[PDB]
């Protein structure tokens, strides 16, 4: 009488690290679905928006440097900005110091600006068309 | 970077950044395509009851296995698979040193052994109490897989008459080891509690606890 | 093989190495 699903939750929780696992115990696939020392914590995500507010859209080196110790991705960084502001070109939000209530406005205006044109993709407008 | 075959006219090195430009609008869409999938929610090839834990076995503890293993599975475990990284690498030592009595009162052991460290896993597991029984060899070119065991098997749990030792690639020039051996265990021990050692997320398999540095 | 975030790694790279030799000149 061994219940190897309750087994392998209830091993998950005491021996796993916390992105393999969910609190709940149970698997974290999204961990999985990206390399080994490449994956993206949520965690990070908010280490990402406070760093917009007190260093700018633009300086990822200076963010890096103070949220991430100098280890995460300046391109990743550049990457992830663009699905908080769902647009494929963030050129014209170099430098602005972006709150993190305004960037979910920004997100939403401009998701909503790229489905009224059908310039919309994958929750991010494409301004950039090739 | 590289250098030399970089480009150093000028009607070069434009062309070069015009098409780079165009690639990376190319892969930004597949990259967010991929994380809006990832993001809401794809899965894992990962089968549900699998338990990964990146560590390296010389820092960690095996006693917090131990004991939350006590604390769920109410037995130590009845089969345990390793493919030591004989010398990224860990020293022959390091691996000898592995407290691997403490881990597995009564069951098997299967240790992948290549033909320089051959006599070497036999003495090395006949140290860790286990009896030197059976080797199971894969056909890729030859890697030899050695069994032993320790205490007592005698319990109904286990399966004398398992499948046929020979094993063969799944794929042609292939360097994973192959998953028809989670299947003799599977017919050794069904549903047994199993530990890998020196996993690999390919090695992930339901039922299976498994270490490694790169899960 | 690469992944999508390593292709955009070594784009990147690529293209601050050619606008520096753009700029070179
Ligand atoms: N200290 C350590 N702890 C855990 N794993 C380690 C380690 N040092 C090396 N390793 C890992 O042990 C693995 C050896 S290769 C294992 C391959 C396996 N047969 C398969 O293909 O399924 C590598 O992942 C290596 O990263």
Redesign the pocket.
Known sequence: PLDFTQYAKNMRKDLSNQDICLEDGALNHSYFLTKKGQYWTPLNQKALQRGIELFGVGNWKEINYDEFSGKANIVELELRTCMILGINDITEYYGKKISEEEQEEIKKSNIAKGKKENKLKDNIYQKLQQ | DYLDRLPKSKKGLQGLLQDIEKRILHYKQLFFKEQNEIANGKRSMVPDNSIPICS???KLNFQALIDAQMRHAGKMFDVIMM?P?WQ?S?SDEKIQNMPIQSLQQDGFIFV?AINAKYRVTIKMIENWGYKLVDEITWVKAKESCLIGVKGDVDNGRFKKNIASDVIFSERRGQS??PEEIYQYINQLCPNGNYLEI?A?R??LHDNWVS????L | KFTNLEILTHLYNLKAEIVRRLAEQ
């Open positions: 390296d076995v010389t493919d990284p990224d860990l992948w994973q080891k020196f690999r390919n090695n270490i490694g540095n790169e």
